[PDB]
Amino acid sequence: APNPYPNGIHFDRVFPTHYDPLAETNRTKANLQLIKYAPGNYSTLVVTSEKLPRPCIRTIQNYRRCQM
Amino acid sequence: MDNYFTAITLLGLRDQNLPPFKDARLQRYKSIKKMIDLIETTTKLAPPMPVELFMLNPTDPEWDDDMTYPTITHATALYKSSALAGNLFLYAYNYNNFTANIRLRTMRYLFPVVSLAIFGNIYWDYRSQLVKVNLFDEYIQARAQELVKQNEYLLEHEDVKRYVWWYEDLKETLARVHRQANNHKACDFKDSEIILQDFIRRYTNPKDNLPIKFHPQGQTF
């Protein structure tokens, strides 16, 4: 799997490690007492939307149809 | 359930008993609904009085000292005195060794020097704390009397008289309020509405967009 894209977000456990994702080529593995990395090793930023309930959609369609 | 004592008094629970049936009883509860709005309005027409009358202004730069309270640690001085007395017992319990055994000569020679230095610290802290408490007590009394004579004149303002006259007008008005009937209707205080409305009309202008106007020293709650 490719090296995850550099992400400076991390969470310390014992001491501040000052993690720099650009200081090493391959990201070192996360030890339990040292660091926890940000979620989504392989993730991008998108925009999403919830789907309105089906009965709420049927009333919107009925209003538009009755309107036109 | 605010205005509890007012509502209980208007219902007559101070002198009589409510009707035992829910119909007439629940109508009597809704009958004081108009009078509560009137008495609530009367209590929001009080004129202002100088706030610097019984309360010094806390935002004055004089109080930027952030002075603390000087105290005497009685418990600390009493413990350390008992621990010093414990050393005196330890010497007395072991008197014969500390006195005759030459291997303990340094303890015999320098025990009182350490004991005096220990007593010196116990009494110094107590004595210094005692002086600071007395300096604090004598200043707040002297400074308070200077501020009283400085602000005595504020009691000569007419706003104090305007405030008392309004309170006495409310007392005479609420004394004239009376229950007129026992029909468990709002008209049981029919004449009292006219009395209280005349009081409200006396200190406000009903034909305004905002009869009750806001000012920072006003009545909200």
Partner: protein, 99 residues
């Protein structure tokens, strides 16, 4: 949101030290005079105020105490009652409150 999250409006510089995390310096931090140089400076101001700035002080203190009141009508009552009948705008110019 992270519980240890702060928003700072002035620049800070963090230390690049292992096992430690702190602010080691502030950018463009200029050191003023020492505590002793400031003390000598204040002594000169306090000395002139002690020698040459004590006459007519009782009147100015009354004007200052009157202007710390909440309402203006109480200030005018204080000036008229305690300050020998001083004017509002005239006393405000003395104290330096007039633009």
């Amino acid at each position: 949101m992270q519980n240890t999250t702060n928003i700072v409006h002035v620049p800070v510089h963090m230390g690049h030290t292992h096992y430690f995390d702190y602010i080691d310096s502030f950018p463009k931090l200029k050191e003023g005079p020492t505590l002793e140089e400031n003390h000598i400076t204040n002594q000169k101001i306090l000395r002139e105020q002690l020698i040459s700035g004590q006459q007519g002080l009782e009147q100015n203190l009354c004007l200052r105490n009157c202007f710390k009141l909440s309402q203006k009508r109480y200030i005018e009552f204080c000036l008229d009652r305690k300050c020998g009948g001083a004017d509002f705008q005239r006393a405000a110019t003395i104290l330096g409150y007039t633009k």
